[PDB]
Amino acid sequence: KVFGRCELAAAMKRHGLDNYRGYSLGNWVCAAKFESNFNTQATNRNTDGSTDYGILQINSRWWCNDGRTPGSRNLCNIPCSALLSSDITASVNCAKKIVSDGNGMNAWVAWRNRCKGTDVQAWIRGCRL
């Protein structure tokens, strides 16, 4: 499903992402905007043969198993297809493991190049208090 901006902001807040590891909710909505355009079904294959899955484009080389990435580590212990669900719970629980791994949100190349250091507050403007 393609979330709307305020709609995604509210679901992420319910899942405890606002200020998870000190990253405010605007950061997570901006990451999802530029990673998938708010679309839970987005997939993209990488140069090395791994694929990125879902709203936060989580990669099969380390985080989920998709049956076709040699050396996939599957650290969130999920099939990658679970990350394409209209329910974002598995994507959020895996993203909390990724962001806690020491490199923060720099793990999402679109967050580093398009969101980091911008006014990310503009992304949750209008979301219900």
Token duo for residue 20:
């998870």
State the catalytic residue, choosing from 7, 18, 35, 66. Answer: 35
Query: Active-site residue 35, yes or no?
Result: yes
Give the separation between CA 75 and CA 5, rounded to whole angstroms: 29
Residue given tokens 């990488």 in the structure block? 46
CA angle (93 as vertex; 16, 47 as ends), nearest 5 = 125
Query: Active-site residue 52, yes or no?
Result: yes
Cβ atoms 12, 28 nearer than 8 A:
yes
State the catalytic residue, choosing from 52, 66, 87, 119. Answer: 52
Cβ atoms 94, 58 nearer than 8 A:
yes
101 is an annotated ligand-binding site residue: yes
Q: Binding site membership for substrate: which residues?
A: 101
| Residues acting as catalytic residues | 35, 52
Q: Binding site membership: which residues?
A: 101
